[PDB]
Amino acid sequence: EMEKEFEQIDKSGSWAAIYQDIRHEASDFPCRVAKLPKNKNRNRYRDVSPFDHSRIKLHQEDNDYINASLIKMEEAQRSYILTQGPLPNTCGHFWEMVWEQKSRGVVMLNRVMEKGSLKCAQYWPQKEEKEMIFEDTNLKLTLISEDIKSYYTVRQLELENLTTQETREILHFHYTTWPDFGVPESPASFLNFLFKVRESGSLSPEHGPVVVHCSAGIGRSGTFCLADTCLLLMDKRKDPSSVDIKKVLLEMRKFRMGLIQTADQLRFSYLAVIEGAKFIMGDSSVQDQWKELSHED
Ligand SMILES: NCc1ccc(NC(=O)C(=O)O)cc1
Ligand SMILES: [Mg+2]
């Protein structure tokens, strides 16, 4: 199992090598359209692209490209869209994806500024009064409310198709205390956050796939999905032992490159899943322990 494996890797200090095998075994698929000249300003990082086979296509004549991938987890029956943080020129496309993909939730795992640089455009309105309009995609976005907690913030937004005057409620779950290439403060705050997302219905199959992003859409986003999928599988067969994390991760990496960016992010994934297993297997009290230990208020 994973807990025994976790200790075996730990007490030998071999996470770097376990993580490197994963890196070495990971799928390599082509990213032809990401690399087209006409798409250079649509990509935040040169070395982070969506595979053609799993990329999300914008529904438009002109240019249907966005740096976003559908990760479709067959056995788990969960899909996620992983994407880079929007660029000043792709905030319209981003909100277009969300509309067309019928997404209910957006999980943001980074801050707009980290380490003195700009990791993501300010793609949602910070004030109720000052809604945003995306003229290129004919979408309007309004802040309806927010709930600021100590290390994450939840917002309600209303997205309007200005063409059909049709509106939707989107939930924005914003984790504000996770350093790029880092890990969360502890399993508890991460898990408390994950279960907040779940409790919202954002991950439910009656909606389009959740949009998950960090700066690149792979390190912190990969960590989130991996843990979520792993806990889901464990829940579905109520068998902690049947779940092989490394194998789930390799499965996810068929759909987008680079998922989990450091060995420590891998170790943390193990950690989060092992701790989340408690709740899955019938210990309802741990959720309240996570809320306390997270120091939410
Ligand atoms: N080195 C390219 C590169 C740049 C940024 C990232 N960030 C993330 O995955 C993240 O936001 O966690 C990952 C890879
Ligand atoms: Mg105000």
Side-chain angles (χ1 to χ4, degrees):
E1 89 141 311
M2 68 179 310
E3 190 151 26
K4 300 161 208 150
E5 189 191 4
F6 179 85
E7 291 173 7
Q8 187 277 122
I9 299 158
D10 244 31
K11 108 178 227 272
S12 70
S14 45
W15 284 106
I18 295 296
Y19 178 63
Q20 206 58 41
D21 296 350
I22 281 153
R23 273 229 260 238
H24 196 251
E25 308 295 351
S27 309
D28 194 15
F29 293 117
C31 299
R32 262 92 88 162
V33 2
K35 283 310 202 190
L36 290 177
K38 73 174 183 185
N39 291 328
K40 194 214 203 167
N41 69 11
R42 291 190 176 204
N43 286 315
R44 176 173 292 281
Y45 302 103
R46 269 199 33 223
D47 50 335
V48 183
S49 300
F51 300 140
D52 296 323
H53 87 78
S54 62
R55 80 187 178 92
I56 304 290
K57 301 182 208 193
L58 266 19
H59 302 173
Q60 46 154 286
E61 303 191 42
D62 170 48
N63 185 353
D64 74 0
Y65 181 73
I66 182 161
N67 190 324
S69 306
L70 181 68
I71 299 191
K72 203 215 202 98
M73 297 310 279
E74 192 158 59
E75 170 176 15
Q77 309 274 27
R78 195 154 273 167
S79 281
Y80 319 86
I81 292 166
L82 268 66
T83 190
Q84 66 191 16
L87 293 156
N89 59 310
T90 56
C91 295
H93 310 145
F94 174 94
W95 287 115
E96 195 194 336
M97 183 167 61
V98 163
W99 185 270
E100 296 160 0
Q101 297 315 316
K102 297 173 186 306
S103 293
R104 202 266 178 288
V106 173
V107 180
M108 174 169 185
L109 292 177
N110 69 282
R111 284 179 282 104
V112 164
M113 180 168 291
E114 305 182 313
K115 290 178 181 266
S117 306
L118 289 158
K119 300 313 201 197
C120 184
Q122 185 53 55
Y123 64 93
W124 79 93
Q126 300 203 95
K127 280 159 173 202
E128 290 81 337
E129 312 88 85
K130 286 230 181 298
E131 75 281 357
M132 308 174 67
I133 302 196
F134 302 105
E135 280 167 273
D136 66 347
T137 61
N138 211 38
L139 287 156
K140 183 166 87 149
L141 184 64
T142 304
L143 175 72
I144 299 313
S145 72
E146 24 162 18
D147 190 48
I148 304 177
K149 306 293 206 187
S150 58
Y151 72 105
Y152 76 93
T153 289
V154 183
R155 316 192 173 71
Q156 291 179 249
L157 306 149
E158 171 191 291
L159 186 59
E160 179 167 343
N161 189 354
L162 258 29
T163 302
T164 66
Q165 276 166 30
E166 192 188 329
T167 80
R168 276 175 202 165
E169 172 162 279
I170 315 283
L171 279 16
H172 199 248
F173 296 90
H174 187 181
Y175 197 111
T176 50
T177 48
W178 192 338
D180 201 352
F181 295 98
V183 297
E185 303 99 297
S186 76
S189 11
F190 176 80
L191 290 171
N192 174 62
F193 178 77
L194 174 56
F195 286 82
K196 275 272 155 154
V197 175
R198 285 175 161 203
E199 287 172 358
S200 78
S202 287
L203 286 163
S204 305
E206 77 267 15
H207 298 113
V210 69
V211 182
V212 184
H213 85 80
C214 43
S215 196
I218 61 183
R220 292 177 282 182
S221 296
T223 299
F224 181 88
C225 301
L226 175 63
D228 177 60
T229 273
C230 285
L231 294 165
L232 225 215
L233 292 162
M234 189 177 298
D235 213 8
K236 183 197 75 83
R237 46 219 183 168
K238 295 277 174 164
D239 199 352
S241 279
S242 72
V243 164
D244 186 341
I245 302 208
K246 300 164 303 322
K247 281 194 176 64
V248 177
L249 183 52
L250 261 344
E251 183 62 31
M252 288 191 155
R253 275 179 178 237
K254 302 175 170 180
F255 297 96
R256 189 180 177 78
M257 63 172 64
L259 299 183
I260 314 284
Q261 276 292 279
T262 75
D264 193 35
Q265 283 180 356
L266 186 63
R267 176 182 197 276
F268 185 84
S269 299
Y270 273 76
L271 228 35
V273 169
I274 291 164
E275 183 62 27
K278 295 170 173 191
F279 186 69
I280 275 32
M281 299 309 279
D283 182 353
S284 287
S285 74
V286 298
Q287 194 171 16
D288 310 283
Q289 283 148 45
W290 302 335
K291 189 183 198 193
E292 293 309 89
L293 260 35
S294 79
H295 306 116
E296 207 175 48
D297 301 313

